[PDB]
């Protein structure tokens, strides 16, 4: 959301947060000095790589270590026999299975 | 019946049914958390455990 410079009231839920995560945004666009013409050629969606889910984060004052999952579920850190489940945003998401209940089959 | 009247006489008759079975299905659910299932067979040590 940062990155990006996108509005306020696209997904005015997590803006308010967005600046209390991290700061005005500098501290974050300072490693890539090319996101105005990063948008030009139309690349940006050429260089990521999803991941998907954390699983442990070690921490220290300059350098974080992230475990992160693929291919599956995730087994957890604090716990044995648990799983780390995705969480989001409720800004970002978007459903397409409601409608008004007026039928067609699941799966 | 017999019986003597101007109609011709009947016939003796005979009737033989088809009857057969209907089938039923009954289902059940059971879900046991994955978190539980193991811990049958856990690493059995403490007396919390």
């Not at chain 1, 005005?24 to 300072?30: I, R």
């Not at chain 1, 690349?43 to 999952?69: I, N, R, Y």
Request: proline fraction near 6%.
């Amino acid at each position: 959301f940062m990155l990006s410079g996108m509005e306020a009231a696209k997904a005015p839920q997590t803006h308010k947060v967005a600046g209390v995560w991290y700061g005005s945004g500098s501290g974050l666009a300072d490693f890539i000095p090319n996101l105005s013409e990063l948008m030009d050629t139309g690349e940006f969606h050429t260089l990521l790589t999803p991941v998907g889910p954390m699983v442990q984060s070690v921490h220290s004052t300059f350098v974080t270590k992230v475990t992160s999952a693929m291919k599956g579920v995730g087994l957890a850190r604090d716990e044995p026999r648990a799983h780390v489940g995705l969480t989001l945003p409720c800004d970002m998401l978007v459903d397409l299975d409601e409608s008004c209940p007026m039928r067609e089959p699941a799966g | 019946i017999a019986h003597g009247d101007g109609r011709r006489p009947n016939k003796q008759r005979q009737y033989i049914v088809m009857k057969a079975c209907n089938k039923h299905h009954i289902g059940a659910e059971i879900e046991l958390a994955a978190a539980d299932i193991e811990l049958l067979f856990a690493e059995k040590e403490t007396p919390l455990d």
